[PDB]
Structure 1
Amino acid sequence: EVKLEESGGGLVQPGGSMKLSCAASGFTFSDAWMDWVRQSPEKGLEWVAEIGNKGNNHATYYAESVKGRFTVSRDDSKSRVYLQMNSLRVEDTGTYYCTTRFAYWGQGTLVTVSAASTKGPSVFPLAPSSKSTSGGTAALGCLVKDYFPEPVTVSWNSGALTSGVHTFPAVLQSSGLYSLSSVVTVPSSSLGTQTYICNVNHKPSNTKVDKRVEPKSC
């Protein structure tokens, strides 16, 4: 089976440098052309660089946007392709994928080019309403506020609760920090008996939070 796995991304300041790496297996690497492609909500999918196989002398090709700043290279003995990015710009932000000339793709590595500092989130309860319809359905959740960079993941009850869960896409606030919410609907009857915990992970800040959400006392 063909496998590709990118690494090296993260937060970096404008003008800075970052090297991405892609580990490949499941095919004869030296015979494969390789590419880097990036994706952003802004610009969609953009081809970045291409590097030839050994028969084509590892010839390199670049998007004009990155020419002179980015360098694609490979180590056939290691089955690795690399992307060295210098003089990084805010608009270089995106998910970077390595691909076998567009046949197979890795999972991607997120590159955030920003002058802003890493910040872990605060987690606040979205407490079930005291007017939750008797015998009906209640909603509860957690608000994951003010983090940078992306991403954040959320689970409920350590993965034991998945039904009725909606975890919303993050929104970029005017402050430049992200926020997201996760909610779950449950039987009103269960609010007095069951415990609900949202598990929040912000790996960029090494921040994990387990927030128990319960009805507000009165």
Structure 2
Amino acid sequence: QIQLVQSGPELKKPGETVKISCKASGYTFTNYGMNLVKQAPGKGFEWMGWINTFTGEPTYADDFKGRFVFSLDTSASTAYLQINNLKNEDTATYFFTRGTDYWGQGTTLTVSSAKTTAPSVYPLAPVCGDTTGSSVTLGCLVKGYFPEPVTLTWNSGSLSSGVHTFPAVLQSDLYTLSSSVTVTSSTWPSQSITCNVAHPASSTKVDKKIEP
């Protein structure tokens, strides 16, 4: 049960600051050092530097020895990455790693003078296929939101098998995402299928019942 859990998604304006955190659990925090990794959109992994979890002394790679601060809270097995004077270039997903083998689920930070925009969630119901294969595919459409990311599930997680969540796409300045789910023609409208969606940035969270 060696896990590293990072703080939620972030949306900040240029010049603002952020303090992303990570919590270790499952191993002796101060016996392994931690690394920090960046990943801009579409790009590869960029090593930001590391933290001696024993000494607490941080080390920044040449590009981050300017506006980045790495710190700890030994007692809580928690490391913090603070970025000051944010710039559009800072937009990316940051990771913490225990040495070189374990990563956190990541943390997506977005920096832009663009204001948040909740996403409009639309259900999606059949019309074609019915029982020529016996399966039925329902969907859900989340469009026109900003920034990334949005969280979606079916029936608050209970329905995870046979589901397909496609990567968000960029519009003018809004992301649209889609997701499908397939079940046996019988179980619907037999059972109730609901689409769960949350757009952290907009402190939003919506659900949509799907019907014929």
TM range (shorter): 0.7 to 0.9
Please name the residue that 1:61 is paired with: 59
Would you say how many aligned residue pairs link Structure 1 and Structure 2?
211
Report the CA distance shift for 1:163/1:104 in structure 2 as closer, same or farther (over 3 A): closer
Distance 1:26 1:188 in 2: 44
- Identity rate, percent: 55
Distance 1:120 1:96 in 2: 23
Please name the residue that 2:179 is paired with: 182
Q: CA deviation at 1:9?
A: 4.8
Report the CA distance shift for 1:121/1:74 in structure 2 as closer, same or farther (over 3 A): same
Please name the residue that 1:48 is paired with: 48
Please name the residue that 2:81 is paired with: 83
**Residue 143 (1) aligns with residue 141 (2):** yes
Distance 1:214 1:143 in 2: 14
Q: CA deviation at 1:133?
A: 4.3
Report the CA distance shift for 1:44/1:211 in structure 2 as closer, same or farther (over 3 A): same
Q: CA deviation at 1:45?
A: 0.9
Please name the residue that 1:206 is paired with: 203
TM-score (norm 2): 0.83
Distance 2:188 2:29 in 1: 56
Single out whichever of 12-21 and 30-39 deviates more from structure 2: 30-39
CA contact (8 A) 1:8 1:19 kept: no
1:111 counterpart SS class: strand
Please identify the structure whose Cα radius of gyration is greater: 1
TM-score (norm 1): 0.81
Single out whichever of 97-106 and 117-126 deviates more from structure 2: 97-106
CA contact (8 A) 1:40 1:95 kept: yes
Report the CA distance shift for 1:132/1:86 in structure 2 as closer, same or farther (over 3 A): same
CA contact (8 A) 1:132 1:188 kept: no
Report the CA distance shift for 1:195/1:13 in structure 2 as closer, same or farther (over 3 A): same
Q: CA deviation at 1:193?
A: 4.1
Q: CA deviation at 1:77?
A: 4.3
Give 5+ residue unaligned stretches, structure 1: none
Distance 2:157 2:52 in 1: 44
Please name the residue that 2:113 is paired with: 115
CA contact (8 A) 2:71 2:81 kept: yes
